[PDB]
Amino acid sequence: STIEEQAKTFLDKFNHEAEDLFYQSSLASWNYNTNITEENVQNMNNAGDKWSAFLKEQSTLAQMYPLQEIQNLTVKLQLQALQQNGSSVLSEDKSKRLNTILNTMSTIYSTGKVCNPDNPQECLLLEPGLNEIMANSLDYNERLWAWESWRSEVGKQLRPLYEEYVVLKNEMARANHYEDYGDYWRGDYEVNGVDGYDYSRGQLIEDVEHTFEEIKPLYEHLHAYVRAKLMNAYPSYISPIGCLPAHLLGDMWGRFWTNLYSLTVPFGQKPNIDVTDAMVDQAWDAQRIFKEAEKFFVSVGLPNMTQGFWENSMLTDPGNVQKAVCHPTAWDLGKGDFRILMCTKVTMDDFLTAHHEMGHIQYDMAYAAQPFLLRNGANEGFHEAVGEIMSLSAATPKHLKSIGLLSPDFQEDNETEINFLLKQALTIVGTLPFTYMLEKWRWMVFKGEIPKDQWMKKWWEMKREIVGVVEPVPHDETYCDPASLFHVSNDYSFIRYYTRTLYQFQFQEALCQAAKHEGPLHKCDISNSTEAGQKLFNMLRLGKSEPWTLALENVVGAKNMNVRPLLNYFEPLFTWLKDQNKNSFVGWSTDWSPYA
């Protein structure tokens, strides 16, 4: 009679049907992903339509039961998730326009494109031809031209579209309870109710700012090194006291400066840490790249996958007549029908991505006993952190030497450790300030603080100071760099990257502490040690039944993210980093611009 048991008697009635419908929708999605045909996408859209409609009735059904008689965390979560994720607050006149603007944004990001300078020949998209030049092709003129051509062909017309989408999404957000659309993305880590684990969405921004301030001392030295190397390479434009031109960051928007690392090489006599050659040497194929990964997972206590998984997993791009997508994606079809769709042929990056996907699959497998609506224990930050830490632990040279990917002759001298630690730093600290700036800027935009006519003004004001990167061309309000992004156009959060950046280091230090491994955080090999694997499996099977802060306290200890694992992980790097950076100007000139 009490609503507490009425909620569960309603739940178990539709739980099986919801599981079946989700399985069918995922089946249609995987079919279209494997089979690129009009009927396959039609089946995707139809199955998604049934699932969304069922969520539409489920929202009202959940709203039927009051939430003031609910005390179970499981029942509370299950009832609340369907209330908002299967309903919308915007009326038809506004919801239809919001959906249309989202579709047009995605289309303009995809269809809208630029190519070779002043040539009506065969063209290429951003990642194939433009972001490729921005990433690896080290050429000032080409990168400088593309950095504005892509935005004038995509972000220019998307700027009014992005503004209208921001207004519409804010209209949707502020209606029920939120204060902005950024409150939606800040709710991925909000914790309330349970004693000893409480959080506020406003305090998350303060935590991100504090982490940025903590990384600032390292990031300014990294900026000094990058500016010195750029001045050595291109003294024509880069000043020894200014910022870094955005095009000279190994990408269009600076996140992973791996090619910029090549110019900023600490030691030219770096030994071989590459096992890509060893893949050919030791006869590595698609199956083995996952087989030794499974062996490593078993050695740490994580059970392998079933043969049915391997008989439904696509480890190699089909090509031929039925083309597919080579983008790494691990698939959980439902009811123990895990799949995959990615490529692993001859490279060490294939090995790392295999560990990434295997960690994700094991994490999803662990909480299989949890209820379907509680299968959302895959916290995006925690999920990506686990995927990254598994590859980080398996990438240690000790594990490769033991397996056979490397040899005992090669040693971890100062040159080697400095080289790979600084290579990882150029991708981690390379993206940390930019990620923080983007998150804060989009939060303020969705809050309405940034004027619609001064988006780029505030963007560059923060870029020159917070990021220490100044635009190589006088970019202005006409274009929109964020609008020309895949995640933004598809309306995807980016706080996931910033959270996982510290979450992975917290997980790594927790694993090394639990296993009592002897060695630094940059050489932590826990292959044959499963002691930390037991606690890792406990956290994996916890699922969405306990707050993520509680799991972090049980494993790491600190409820909030901490930079100290990053600090002592980079300390051997920091020793050499200090010497080569105090010589140059630690600061940068915000007023100075690369375009003279």
Binding site: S1, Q6, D12, K13, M64, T306, G308, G336
Partner: protein
Amino acid sequence: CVADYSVLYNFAPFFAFKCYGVSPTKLNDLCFTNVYADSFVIKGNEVSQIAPGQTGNIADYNYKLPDDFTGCVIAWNSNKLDSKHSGNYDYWYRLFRKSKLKPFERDISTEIYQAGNKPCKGKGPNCYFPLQSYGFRPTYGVGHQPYR
């Protein structure tokens, strides 16, 4: 009739041959007053629920074994026999029942009863169909496949 249990061994590679009151190896050297055989199909994860004293979803509502049980329980996999891509909805099982079921008794009913407080008198608040089907598919893993 002459009861030969040898034909049962080679019929199928059974993975569960629990025998309670009689050791299986002596089954060929005994005589019984009467023999009863019952057949049904369930999912893998419910296989453990077929035992005396054991309490679960299936035992409490569908098939309850008395404690004084002297027979044998045999279960073998039949995934490839009754797996279809569309969904094997032809098989049905009771999703939930109002009251406990007496051992060695069966209930055939589909009346939509009120599983709440206010009398439903039809489909509505907390009033649901007692039965519920399931779509077995060949791509399913162990635990969601037909078992005889």
